Amino acid sequence: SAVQQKLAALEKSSGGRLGVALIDTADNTQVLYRGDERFPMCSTSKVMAAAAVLKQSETQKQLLNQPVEIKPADLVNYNPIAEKHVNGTMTLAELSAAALQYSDNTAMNKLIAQLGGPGGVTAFARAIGDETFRLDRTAPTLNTAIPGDPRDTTTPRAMAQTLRQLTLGHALGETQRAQLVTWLKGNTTGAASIRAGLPTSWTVGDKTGSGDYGTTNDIAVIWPQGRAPLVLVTYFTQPQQNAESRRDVLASAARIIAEG
Numbered sequence: 001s002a003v004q005q006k007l008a009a010l011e012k013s014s015g016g017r018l019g020v021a022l023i024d025t026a027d028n029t030q031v032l033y034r035g036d037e038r039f040p041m042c043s044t045s046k047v048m049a050a051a052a053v054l055k056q057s058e059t060q061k062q063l064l065n066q067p068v069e070i071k072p073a074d075l076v077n078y079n080p081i082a083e084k085h086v087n088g089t090m091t092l093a094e095l096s097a098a099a100l101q102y103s104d105n106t107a108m109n110k111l112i113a114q115l116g117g118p119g120g121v122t123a124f125a126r127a128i129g130d131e132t133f134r135l136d137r138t139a140p141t142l143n144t145a146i147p148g149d150p151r152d153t154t155t156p157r158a159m160a161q162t163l164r165q166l167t168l169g170h171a172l173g174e175t176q177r178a179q180l181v182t183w184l185k186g187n188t189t190g191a192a193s194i195r196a197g198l199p200t201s202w203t204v205g206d207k208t209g210s211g212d213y214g215t216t217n218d219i220a221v222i223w224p225q226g227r228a229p230l231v232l233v234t235y236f237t238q239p240q241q242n243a244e245s246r247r248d249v250l251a252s253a254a255r256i257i258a259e260g
């Protein structure tokens, strides 16, 4: 098709490996590029950890208000929010917001501990029908993004289908789904990614991710005013371990997609 040629064109211009999946929920049609390929999710896996805690909240109604200690042993490479509350507590809602809207790695690890380990995150993915997602490690080592390593990976197709079920479908409760949607709106880390390639009149909820080998990821759910919603997944990784981030590729992929 035409979109596949331009996506393949910008992948060649980038020197890396692009993975794209858009779900057009108007006709339930799909446009995919390397859609069944394994990519490191990096911090985009935090959506699955936040959604899994939200699923736990459908029986323990008062769970997001439960305080959780933050103390020096908990801090790792990048903790923009949990750094402010060391030797204090942080409720599971403020850690979920820190993980989604600021990509706080300590918040992720607290989300992972609440679920009983990374196997508890993968469990929730299998329960909602995702057989491809797998979380193996905690932050920050889940961002190693070594080529060929199946650890902490998924495919663009699977993550787009899952993100549709979480934010648009009914894999979560309505109070849970509205909370995750409201969280993805408040994201502060995706200005130069998928958002930069979409019309400004388009409201977007997204979660970014980045790691070694220049991995630059972004998953988004998009609501054009007057039109049926879209979910977009753009994964990108590079051959050099020390490669720099390429958020511009993610914006250009979304621009090629938005022209459809």
Ligand SMILES: *C(=O)[C@@H](NC(=O)[C@H](N)c1ccccc1)[C@@H]1N[C@@H](C(=O)O)C(C)(C)S1
Pocket (backbone or CB within 6 Å): 042, 043, 044, 077, 078, 102, 103, 105, 139, 140, 143, 189, 208, 209, 210, 211, 212
């Ligand atoms: C997940 O993607 C996280 N990335 C890391 O922990 C990497 N070790 C790292 C890469 C680059 C700079 C700092 C740490 C966090 N999520 C990224 C993102 O959302 O773009 C991040 C750069 C904010 S860190």
